[PDB]
Design a binder for this molecule. Structure first.
Ligand SMILES: O=C(O)c1nn(Cc2ccc(Cl)c(Cl)c2)c(=O)c2cc(Oc3ccccc3)ccc12
Ligand SMILES: O=C(O)c1nn(Cc2ccc(Cl)c(Cl)c2)c(=O)c2cc(Oc3ccccc3)ccc12
Lengths: 261, 260
């Protein structure tokens, strides 16, 4: 069909921009985690000793240092997601204020989606897959900090059972950015016309790439409720840390995103 | 077979008509709708409330914001039994582990109540007492410090949910998809729940394609609204624990309602 064909070209375009925007793809993450010979095995951090050994190999309190580590990686992800968003057709043509709103609300939902790529049951890849930090070591951190990652692992284990690949995820993250139910949006209709087109492209991609996977489209859109709950839970955890650690700085970029969310 | 999807759509519509007295078609006729054969009594004010209690026979009723809250709770307890009856008509539901049926109802009913509340709302108010009354959004915002923003978030949800222009035949399937959620906590056997929710999502997809052929990606937009339902529900429960810190200290009344 002429219309299918425009949907495949949109899918190829977004996958292309996704590869160019995100240095560590799920395909590379899965090669490192499942020990494929295409990639180097990571140094594993499971305790204080392996952590300090990590400083040497992969290149102030421990819970805090790991937390600032996450923080900076989040800032980097925000920069890669903002560069991907510019590639989404129509996005840069929107009201500048709506561009800002779509990024502010969308970026955390995208971070937890793509963070699932780097996770299994037992832990998470770090320093572009040169390291692996165990889930158990993260859960054993000091009182406020030991709970930060657990909800991300729980989402990730469920999300990964969908067995999406990068070409699926490129279209899904574009659908997330182009919501239009986000608060404070000036012109909802230009946003929903783009989301509509992205949702058509996602639906055909999943039919073609997962022809045996019944209602994968609906099952993936339902996962949007889990992303919203991880974001809401994470923000109220940051409100606790702000108050118990008055000496701990937050990046302004993260601060501007969380501002009246 | 697309015919077997048309079967459970029909079946769910028939059962939804039997379970829920005030359908969206009826609510709409009375609201923004004209159908001027019997206009609702409007509650806009303290004296409208007091007169309303007089005109409409209210089944609840032995401060003003407390008595409205109690009336809403009474309606919720009735809606739970209507939804429970509807659930038992969904193919496969009664064959699930009984603990899993109870779990699915326990977590589902709140999401269904707000879904169905939207049928009875416009941007200016909510229908009550089976469509015989109408409580204004302004009057509900006007109420005391905690009770003034219990209904507001549901109005904002309803305005947005109602823009989809679903009818009863669409909503009947949507409500079933909500109930058969495999992600409720403490479920013992997720497989048969996800397998029924699969079949229901197929039926809802086909229903929205046939019932709304010019409404692009309605299915996606409706599934996205489930994200908003969960937020409303989590936001509502936290507001409820503050209300359990004003209307403190009947014992048998306490029991009938409960958080459970
Ligand atoms: O740089 C990373 O990729 C990184 N990632 N994660 C998980 C994660 C979180 C958020 C996002 Cl968006 C991504 Cl993609 C990945 C960390 O938890 C993490 C922790 C760090 O702390 C230390 C500190 C001293 C030694 C060793 C590690 C350092 C770096 C990281
Ligand atoms: O009985 C009703 O229909 C009713 N409904 N709602 C909204 C609602 C809630 C849940 C569900 Cl599922 C639905 Cl579908 C609709 C109320 O808020 C409400 C408030 C009341 O308060 C008073 C008290 C004294 C006088 C006048 C009104 C009385 C009755 C009601």
């Amino acid at each position: 069909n002429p219309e299918s064909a425009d949907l495949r070209a949109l899918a190829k375009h977004l996958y292309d921009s996704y590869i160019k925007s995100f240095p560590l793809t799920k395909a590379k993450a899965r090669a490192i985690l499942t020990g494929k010979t295409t990639d180097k095995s990571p140094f594993v951090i499971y305790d204080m000793n392996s952590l300090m050994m990590g400083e040497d190999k992969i290149k102030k309190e421990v819970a805090i240092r790991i937390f600032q580590g996450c923080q900076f990686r989040s800032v980097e992800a925000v920069q890669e997601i903002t560069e991907y968003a510019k590639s989404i057709p129509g996005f840069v043509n929107l009201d500048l204020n709506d561009q800002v709103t779509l990024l502010k609300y969308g970026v955390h939902e995208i971070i937890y989606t793509m963070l699932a790529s780097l996770m299994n049951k037992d832990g998470v890849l770090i320093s572009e897959g040169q390291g692996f930090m165990t889930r158990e070591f993260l859960k054993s951190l000091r009182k406020p900090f030991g709970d930060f990652m657990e909800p991300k692992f729980e989402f990730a284990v469920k999300f990964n059972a969908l067995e999406l690949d990068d070409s699926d995820l490129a279209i899904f993250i574009a659908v997330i950015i182009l919501s239009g139910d986000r608060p404070g949006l000036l012109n909802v209709k230009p946003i929903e016309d783009i989301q509509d087109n992205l949702l058509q492209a996602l639906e055909l991609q999943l039919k073609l790439n997962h022809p045996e996977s019944s209602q994968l489209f609906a099952k993936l859109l339902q996962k949007m409720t889990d992303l919203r709950q991880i974001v809401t839970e994470h923000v109220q955890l940051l409100q606790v840390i702000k108050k118990t650690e008055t000496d701990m700085s937050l990046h302004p970029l993260l601060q501007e995103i969380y501002k009246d969310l």
